[PDB]
Structure formats: structure tokens, C-alpha cells
Design a protein around this nucleic acid. Structure first.
Ligand SMILES: [Mg+2]
Ligand SMILES: [Mg+2]
Ligand SMILES: [Mg+2]
Ligand SMILES: [Mg+2]
Ligand SMILES: [Mg+2]
Ligand SMILES: [Mg+2]
Ligand SMILES: [Mg+2]
Ligand SMILES: [Mg+2]
Ligand SMILES: [Mg+2]
Ligand SMILES: [Mg+2]
Ligand SMILES: [Mg+2]
Ligand SMILES: [Mg+2]
Ligand SMILES: [Mg+2]
Ligand SMILES: [Mg+2]
Ligand SMILES: [Mg+2]
Ligand SMILES: [Mg+2]
Ligand SMILES: [Mg+2]
Ligand SMILES: [Mg+2]
Ligand SMILES: [Mg+2]
Ligand SMILES: [Mg+2]
Ligand SMILES: [Mg+2]
Ligand SMILES: [Mg+2]
Ligand SMILES: [Mg+2]
Ligand SMILES: [Mg+2]
Ligand SMILES: [Mg+2]
Ligand SMILES: [Mg+2]
Ligand SMILES: [Mg+2]
Ligand SMILES: [Mg+2]
Lengths: 23, 116, 137, 96, 86, 208
RNA sequence: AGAGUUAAAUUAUAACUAAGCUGUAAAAAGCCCUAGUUAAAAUAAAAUAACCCACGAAAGUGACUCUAAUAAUCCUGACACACGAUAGCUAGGACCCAAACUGGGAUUAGAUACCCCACUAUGCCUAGCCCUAAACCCAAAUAGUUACAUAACAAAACUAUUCGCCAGAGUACUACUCGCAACUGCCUAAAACUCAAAGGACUUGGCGGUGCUUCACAUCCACCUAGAGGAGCCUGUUCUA
RNA sequence: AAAAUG
């Protein structure tokens, strides 16, 4: 249910953190 | 005595932090849980040990000691008897309360009223 | 026959004897029943080790020494080594909660020792050292 | 019950007491209404689910010449009359 | 360590009965809560899990005590029904 | 399955019926047995009222039969008992006065003692724990123990003999060996006992 | 918020005994300067009481003692002021034990994971920062009512005065601005473009390597018998032709 | 204990 949106935001934050670490 | 319930749950009128956090609503049901069947365990490992002590000491022969062989079969017989008789004896009566099949019927005669 | 389960503390003037000795002179059987091993050591009242026997010393192996049978055999051998030095009564002191707890206790009786008292000296820290993390993450 | 407040006299040490003034005032009309239906050739049925005096209810109804129901009440008894009782039946004109 | 030994958690055997003395000692620890305390202290539990365990145990205890109270209240109606057939 | 649940097992013992008046506890059962209008199954052809037949002999004959040839198995029992008898008689007549008071001439007693000697005490059951099979020692029932004792000898005599060796002669050898506890079936038994003693520590896996 | 103290366990350290100790479903690795018992400072944490529900504005607080002490003759109110769990940063001190990371050993086709062992940052004290949480009891503050009245579930439905927010979803706890002892950061916070949906609760099936009771009677195991898969032949398939 | 995909 709400875990779908929570996981979407979690994935977005994880990808943003990986991008920040790479660049 | 029953533990207190005032000021425990989170409600509109409760001003303080909730104390108890129920997984399911604390409504007394109309049926009790079915009695749990006990998990079995191996029998007379102790007498099996003294049976095998004769075999380890006397080079694995039954003519050396005969009582340690006979009491092992005595254990086999008594364990089979306890497996057969008690499987019905413990399911018939509890000696402390009523069987669940009678308990559910007793509770259904005087059920709880969460509504109205 | 007024019998009390409370220990005979030396402070009182009670008259109880076991093989002619007081409760303060009867040897001790320290029995550490861990989750993977059971170690039995018989010391005297003067804290002199007399007999020592454990499931590891009984010729057992990694997982076979954790069963109650290994504890019973260790108790039997510890009882034999204790009787070798001329002891009749002992006070069992159980340390830790494990599978070889009662089995190694009855091992002394099977090996030829009389148990007069059982004391549960289990380590119960009042939130002292922090234990290890929980398994099955 | 919350709707028995006007029909009570008070509470005698936890036990509520019903005043009999309004009991008699209601019972006069109750008996008058019950008697008028019987006078005008009406079907009167005594419904009562209580396993202590049920025998007394059927005896009273048989002596009265009216009908009684003290057993387990079926589902579509009064609603699904053309099926539970018969093809075409007459519904009870009064229920006690 | 600093206390005198052989006073706490000690049970004296009567007439050589060791198996029953051990059961008495085990009852002492279970009814004082030491067995569950040892099994809980084997592995550390976080405070978040401790609060959940306490809440679940208290709710379960309240439900069990209320169910037992209702059972004991309704034990009187266990008698054979004398109005069978009504 | 042609016999209904009301059909009971017959009783072949003549002495059971010939003396009804000597006891009352057993008197109280057989009058109800037939007053309850209970049906009785037909007596099997293999079991009769003979005084020279034994249930053990019949079982061992049944276990040897291959296919459905019962007369061949009955014969094989005939020559097995005859060969045991004649070998024991040849040994009887070649000894001094002291050994004839000990050497047994009875094939039935020799066979029964051989089975008792070959009967194992404890057996092994494979228990699956942690994805692996462990040989847990378990006490065996009387019927299981006797079945193992019988089957081990039958299997040994079937395979470990020369083609020129006949079944009754090989069985006569192994019967006398198992009577004195020197046969390979005793070795098989002791192997099972040793393999149970080696895994005694694994007996906690059993839950019955 | 300061100052002082430690009951149990644990350990550095000595003495007697043993060859093993730890470790898991099972093992291996590790330690044999190991293990049990008798004595033992320093550090860390504070069984039962607690089936108690108190204090503090919140975060948070329940080993003991002492001092200071818990605003408002009591409405709401910020971008202003002061706090703000854990995690993280700097300097000095401490380090029993636990543990990111790491190195070995298990399992797996792979396992840089769950399982075992050792250890570091860290958890500890003082000073200075960082200002984030599922900071949730997802229910704003102040005085009230049980009147009308159940979308669904859940903690029942609502008044009067206010403050802060809410304009489809993804983009997006994002880019660009301002400010901040924060420089892989925090707060505020879009647009281009894509779609006609995105969402909350529920009913019934189906499933569950969730859990609990009764079972399997040729049936799953425990167990019995005779065979297939090995050879030749017959015959039926898939392949080449 | 173990155990992926359609
Ligand atoms: Mg995304
Ligand atoms: Mg408060
Ligand atoms: Mg829930
Ligand atoms: Mg439920
Ligand atoms: Mg997690
Ligand atoms: Mg301070
Ligand atoms: Mg101390
Ligand atoms: Mg130090
Ligand atoms: Mg190794
Ligand atoms: Mg404390
Ligand atoms: Mg105040
Ligand atoms: Mg204000
Ligand atoms: Mg902070
Ligand atoms: Mg910090
Ligand atoms: Mg460190
Ligand atoms: Mg560590
Ligand atoms: Mg690794
Ligand atoms: Mg919080
Ligand atoms: Mg919120
Ligand atoms: Mg506000
Ligand atoms: Mg509805
Ligand atoms: Mg938008
Ligand atoms: Mg964030
Ligand atoms: Mg940002
Ligand atoms: Mg089959
Ligand atoms: Mg064939
Ligand atoms: Mg073939
Ligand atoms: Mg794939």
C-alpha cells in the first residue's frame, strides 16, 4: 500500500546518494 | 487481579503517551483457543546408555549382562503403552478445567456485546 | 520429620551430619552446563580440585558433546574419579542453562555419588556487559 | 438499557426498580388492545424465547384458543410466509 | 561474589530424592522469572523490541486474565439442563 | 476385503475349548463371543490344528516362497529340517559320553534358538534434520526384530552360496552356526549394534 | 544540571586441576599465553520491583545519596529566541563488553548476505559543532457537548476562536536561489517532458518455503514384495535419409 | 540449514 510510495522514495534517495558519491 | 486498563491505549481523550499498543482490538472473543498438543521426546535415553555400556565394555555380547537388555524392552513396552493410552486420556479430560468443545458452547450461551 | 529446604548456614547451631562431616566440609561439584558443552569439576571444601570430567574429555566431538547423553557420561566419569579419592556426599552447583543440565546432575548418582544439595549459581548480570547481537537478522 | 430510563422508578443498591404506575397505565392499554383484536376475530400469537416456562406459554395459548411460538424462530417465518407456512396464509394480527 | 555462598537458590535434598528436588528448584526460578531472564539475556534485545515485547505481554496477560475471570464466572452454568425439551 | 468389519479372527487352539470349566475369567468371554451374533472368518489353509507345526516355521516358509509356489517352499523346509537333523546325528555319534548330554538333536529347538540369537536388540531409522539423513538408533518391536532376524538369514543364504550348494544344505550350515553364535548373520547383527552405538549421541533427534 | 557511592556479571592479574575451549542443523576456522574453581582493581551498563504509568514543552528519563530545581493569578501566535533521540565531525581522556568496515571459516552456480571467530571506527567522559527520524499516538493549540448522525477501516461523531499546510501522478527529500562553524550536508524549493490516470479502504477467489489441530492406508516417511533404467528381441516415439 | 527464473 503506502510501502509502494515509501519504496519509490527510498529508491530515489539511494540513487541520488550513489550519484553524489560518484560525482 | 486483572491489570489496569485506564490511560493505556491511544485515544482522543487520552492526554498522555499510549502505554499498551494492541496488535488486535482487546475484545473478549466468544471462543477459547484449541488446546495445544505437546511435542514428543525420545524415551529412556538413560536406559539405552546403560544398555550400550555393557556392549562397549564386554565387546558387544548379550550373554554378559541380561538385565540391561531386558529393562530396555521394558522401556519399549511402557513407552508404547504411554503413547497409546495417554493419547486418548489427555484428550478426554484436562483435570483442571473443561474441554474446549464444552467451553465454546458455554461461551456462546453468554456471548459478549461489543455492539449496541 | 520437620525438614526444611533452606540451607544449613554455619551461623546456626543445627545438628546435621553426612558421613560424619558438617555441611561446611562436604565437597562441591561445580557443573557448568553450557549450550555446547558440560564441564564437571569436583573440588573439596578447601577449594582443592579432586575430579574433573567434561563431555569434550569424554572422547566426544563437536555436536555430539552437546547432547544430554554426553553430559550423563561425563557425570559418570567424574563420579568415578571422585570415588577414586574417597568421597561420599557432594553439593552440586549448577552454572548456566543448557541441555546437559539435569542429565549431568543425575550422572553423579548413576556413577555412585549422593547429592544432598543443589545450588543454582547462574550468571545473572543486572544489565552489566552488553551481550552479542541477535541472530536471524 | 438506555431506552428504559423514563420507565424506571430508581435504583435500589444497584438493582433498578420499575415503577408500577406507568406499568399499569401501559397494561390497561395493552390488555384493551389485545382484547379488541380477539373480539374482531384476529389472529393472536404469543412469541416467547425462554427455556424455563415455554410449556406454560403453550398451555396458556391452547386454553386461549390463540397460537404460540416458543421454539427456535426460523428466518423467513413472518417475511417469507408464502414459502415457510404454505401457499397462501393469514399473517398473525397481533404478537404478544 | 561478595555474598556468602550456598544460601541463594539452594534446595536441600530429602531422602536422596534428586529428581524432585531439581523440579522444586526449577519451579523456584520459573516463578521468580530467572529462566526467561537468562533465555532473554543470551542475546541482546534492542529497546524498540523490548517495548513491543512488554506491550504484547501485557495485552496478552490482560486478555488471559479477563477470559479466565469470565470462565470462572460462567462455570456455574455447566450443570445439566433441567428444562430439556422446552 | 471380502471379510466385513464384523468378522473376527478364528481360534485354532483346541486346549482353549477343551477345558472351559477350569476358569471363570476366560469363561466370561466366549459366551459373549457367540451371544453377540459375531461372525467368524474362515480358517486359512496354511494354519491348521497340527501339533507338529509352528507359526515361526510357517512364517519362515512363507518368506522363502518365490512367486506362488508353496509346495517348493514346504519341500525346502522338509530338506532343511532333515539335513539339520542328520548333520546333528552324525555329530552326535562321533563324540564321547560327555558331549551327548549337551548336543541337541531337535531341529525345531535349534531353529528357534538360532532365531533368538539372530534377533537384533536395537535398530536404526533415517531421520531428516538439517537437510541430511542421520541414522538414529530406535528400539524395535518384537515382530520387527524377528522379521529382521529371519530376513537376514534368508538373504544371506540366497546370495552368499555357491551355485552347486543347495538351499537346504546351506541353511543347515548357517542354522548350526547361528545356534552357536558364529555365523555371518550374527556378524551383521553386531554390525547394526555397533553402528547404533556409534550414533547413540544422535538419539535425541527422535521425537517418539 | 552538578558532586559522591556501587549489588550482580565481565576482565587485566596469581594459585591448583584437565587436555582441550569456543563455535552451529551439521561443520570448518579461531584459541590451546586454552578451560574449571578460589581471590581481583579500572571501564561500560543499571536484573525483580514495573500486572507500576509518574516526571519533563518535546526529544527523553526508572542502581543509591546530597545540592540547585521543574515559567506564567495560566487563550492562540512566527521566518525571532532556546532545545532537539540516535547517526556523524574536531581536540583531549577512557576502552570490560558489543560492533559498521575489514580478514578468515561455512552455504550457494555465484554470496563482496543471513550462520561462526577476531578486530577498527563507534557506543563511554569534558569542551565545541552538526540540527536529522516511521521526531507517529501519522489524530494542531485553547474551552467545551453527547444534540443531528455509522463512505470503509482504524482511536465515535462534533462545536466556538485561532495558527501551519493541502490545487492529479511521475519528474522531485530534484536542479537552480538565499541562509547556516554544516563544503559527499541541512532548510526553502521548481521547470522542461511523459500518462490519463496516480491513490485509500473493502468483498470473493487463488496462493503462502506463516502458524495451529485431524489425517495419508498402496501412501509422504518410518517399512514389505516384485520390477524399470544394464543385455537381446518385439513394438511405439524424437531425430537424420 | 539450502533453494533462482517463467
Ligand atoms: Mg525513481
Ligand atoms: Mg505530560
Ligand atoms: Mg496492526
Ligand atoms: Mg485474532
Ligand atoms: Mg533492517
Ligand atoms: Mg555531566
Ligand atoms: Mg564487583
Ligand atoms: Mg585495563
Ligand atoms: Mg579446527
Ligand atoms: Mg540496576
Ligand atoms: Mg508549571
Ligand atoms: Mg503562546
Ligand atoms: Mg541532535
Ligand atoms: Mg557521538
Ligand atoms: Mg574501540
Ligand atoms: Mg567481539
Ligand atoms: Mg566473509
Ligand atoms: Mg518518539
Ligand atoms: Mg505527521
Ligand atoms: Mg499550534
Ligand atoms: Mg459494510
Ligand atoms: Mg505537479
Ligand atoms: Mg532527508
Ligand atoms: Mg537537498
Ligand atoms: Mg507406491
Ligand atoms: Mg521381468
Ligand atoms: Mg533395458
Ligand atoms: Mg533471468
Amino acid at each position: 500500500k503506502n510501502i509502494l510510495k515509501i519504496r519509490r522514495r527510498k529508491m530515489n534517495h539511494h540513487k541520488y546518494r550513489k550519484l553524489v558519491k560518484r560525482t | 487481579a486483572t491489570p489496569s486498563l485506564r490511560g493505556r491505549l491511544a485515544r482522543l481523550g487520552n492526554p498522555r503517551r499510549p502505554i499498551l499498543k494492541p496488535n488486535k482490538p482487546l475484545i473478549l472473543a466468544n471462543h477459547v483457543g484449541e488446546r495445544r498438543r505437546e511435542k514428543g521426546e525420545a524415551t529412556c535415553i538413560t536406559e539405552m546408555s546403560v544398555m550400550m555400556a555393557c556392549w562397549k565394555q564386554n565387546e558387544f555380547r548379550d550373554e554378559a549382562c541380561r538385565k540391561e537388555i531386558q529393562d530396555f524392552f521394558d522401556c519399549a513396552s511402557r513407552a508404547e503403552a504411554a503413547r497409546k493410552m495417554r493419547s486418548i486420556q489427555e484428550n478426554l479430560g484436562e483435570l483442571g478445567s473443561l474441554p474446549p468443545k464444552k467451553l465454546n458452547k458455554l461461551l456462546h450461551r453468554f456471548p459478549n456485546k461489543p455492539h449496541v | 520429620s520437620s525438614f526444611s529446604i533452606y540451607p544449613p548456614i554455619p551461623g546456626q547451631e543445627n545438628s546435621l551430619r553426612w558421613a560424619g562431616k558438617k555441611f561446611e566440609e562436604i565437597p562441591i561439584a561445580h557443573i557448568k552446563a553450557s549450550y555446547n558443552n558440560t564441564q564437571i569439576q569436583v573440588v573439596s571444601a578447601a577449594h582443592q580440585p579432586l575430579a574433573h570430567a567434561s563431555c569434550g574429555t569424554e572422547g566426544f566431538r563437536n555436536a555430539k558433546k552437546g547432547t544430554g547423553i554426553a553430559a550423563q557420561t561425563a557425570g559418570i566419569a567424574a563420579a568415578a574419579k571422585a570415588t577414586g579419592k574417597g568421597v561420599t556426599h557432594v553439593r552440586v552447583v549448577v552454572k548456566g542453562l543448557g541441555p546437559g543440565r539435569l542429565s549431568a546432575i543425575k550422572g553423579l548418582t548413576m556413577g555412585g555419588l549422593e547429592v544432598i544439595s543443589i545450588t543454582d549459581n547462574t550468571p545473572i548480570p543486572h544489565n552489566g556487559c552488553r551481550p552479542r547481537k541477535a541472530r536471524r537478522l | 438499557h438506555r431506552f428504559m430510563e423514563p420507565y424506571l422508578f430508581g435504583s435500589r443498591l444497584g438493582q433498578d426498580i420499575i415503577d408500577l404506575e406507568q406499568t399499569a397505565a401501559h397494561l390497561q392499554l395493552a390488555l384493551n388492545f389485545t382484547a379488541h383484536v380477539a373480539y374482531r376475530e384476529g389472529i393472536i400469537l404469543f412469541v416467547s424465547r425462554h427455556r424455563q416456562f415455554a410449556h406454560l406459554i403453550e398451555t396458556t395459548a391452547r386454553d386461549c384458543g390463540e397460537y404460540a411460538h416458543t421454539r427456535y424462530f426460523k428466518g423467513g417465518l413472518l417475511t417469507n410466509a408464502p414459502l415457510l407456512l404454505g401457499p397462501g396464509v393469514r399473517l398473525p394480527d397481533l404478537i404478544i | 561474589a561478595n555474598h556468602l555462598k550456598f544460601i541463594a537458590r539452594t534446595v536441600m535434598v530429602q531422602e536422596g530424592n534428586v529428581e524432585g528436588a531439581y523440579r522444586t528448584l526449577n519451579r523456584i526460578l520459573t516463578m521468580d522469572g530467572l529462566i526467561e531472564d537468562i533465555k532473554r539475556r543470551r542475546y541482546y534485545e534492542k529497546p524498540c523490541r523490548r517495548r513491543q515485547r512488554e506491550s504484547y505481554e501485557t495485552c496478552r496477560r490482560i486478555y488471559n486474565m479477563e477470559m479466565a475471570r469470565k470462565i470462572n464466572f460462567l462455570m456455574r452454568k455447566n450443570r445439566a439442563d433441567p428444562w430439556q425439551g422446552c | 476385503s471380502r471379510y466385513g468389519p464384523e468378522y473376527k479372527d478364528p481360534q485354532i487352539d483346541k486346549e482353549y475349548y477343551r477345558k472351559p470349566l477350569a476358569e471363570q475369567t476366560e469363561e466370561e468371554k466366549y459366551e459373549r463371543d457367540f451371544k453377540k451374533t459375531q461372525l467368524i472368518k474362515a480358517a486359512p489353509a496354511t494354519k491348521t490344528s497340527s501339533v507338529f507345526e509352528d507359526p515361526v516355521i510357517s512364517k519362515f516358509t512363507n518368506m522363502m516362497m518365490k512367486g506362488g509356489n508353496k509346495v517348493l517352499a514346504r519341500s525346502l523346509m522338509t530338506q532343511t529340517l532333515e539335513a539339520v537333523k542328520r548333520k546333528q546325528f552324525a555329530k552326535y555319534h562321533a563324540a564321547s559320553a560327555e558331549e551327548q548330554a549337551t548336543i541337541e538333536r531337535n531341529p525345531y529347538t535349534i531353529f528357534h534358538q538360532a532365531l533368538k540369537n539372530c534377533e537384533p536388540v536395537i535398530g536404526l531409522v533415517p531421520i531428516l534434520k538439517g537437510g541430511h539423513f542421520y541414522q538414529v538408533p530406535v528400539p524395535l518391536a518384537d515382530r520387527r526384530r524377528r522379521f529382521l532376524a529371519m530376513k537376514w538369514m534368508i538373504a544371506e543364504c540366497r546370495e552368499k552360496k555357491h551355485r552347486r550348494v543347495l538351499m537346504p544344505e546351506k541353511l543347515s550350515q548357517e542354522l548350526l552356526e547361528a545356534f552357536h553364535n558364529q555365523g555371518p548373520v550374527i556378524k551383521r547383527k553386531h554390525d547394526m549394534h555397533k553402528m547404533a552405538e556409534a550414533n547413540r549421541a544422535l538419539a535425541h533427534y527422535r521425537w517418539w
